[PDB]
């Protein structure tokens, strides 16, 4: 596996909190700038983040990212997610499930 964050740098969100953009080292050892549209791989399932879902941003507010959050310096995305009953919940997800494959952000 390996988190993308173990071989990437300078990660930020862009496009209104929808896109992860990072500099990822490739197999030649060079830095390659990569983007991954998080709406293609993260959903909002009744107020919780869902890996393998889609389109979370459509029912999220206050999207926030810290690429090196906490003592363990993990890439944490936070948002308020609406549940099916209309209530918003503060939620967090660690983006370390995203990999760097030869200079590209991927999710499997």
UniProtKB/Swiss-Prot annotation:
Source superkingdom: Eukaryota
Disulphide bond pairs: none
Similarity comment: family membership: Belongs to the cyanovirin-N family.
Annotated function: Mannose-binding lectin.
Protein name: Cyanovirin-N homolog
Organism: Neurospora crassa (strain ATCC 24698 / 74-OR23-1A / CBS 708.71 / DSM 1257 / FGSC 987)
Shown residues in whole-protein numbering: 42 to 95 of 111
């Amino acid at each position: 596996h390996m988190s993308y964050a173990d071989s990437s740098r300078n990660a930020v969100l862009t496009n209104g909190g929808r896109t992860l953009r990072a500099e990822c080292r490739n197999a030649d050892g060079n830095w390659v700038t990569s983007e991954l549209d998080l709406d293609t791989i993260i959903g909002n399932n009744d107020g919780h983040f869902q890996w393998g879902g889609q389109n979370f941003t459509e029912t999220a507010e206050d999207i926030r990212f810290h690429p090196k959050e906490g003592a363990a310096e993990q890439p944490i995305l936070r948002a308020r997610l609406r549940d099916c009953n209309g209530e918003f919940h503060d939620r967090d997800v660690n983006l370390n499930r995203i990999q760097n494959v030869n200079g590209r952000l991927v999710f499997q």
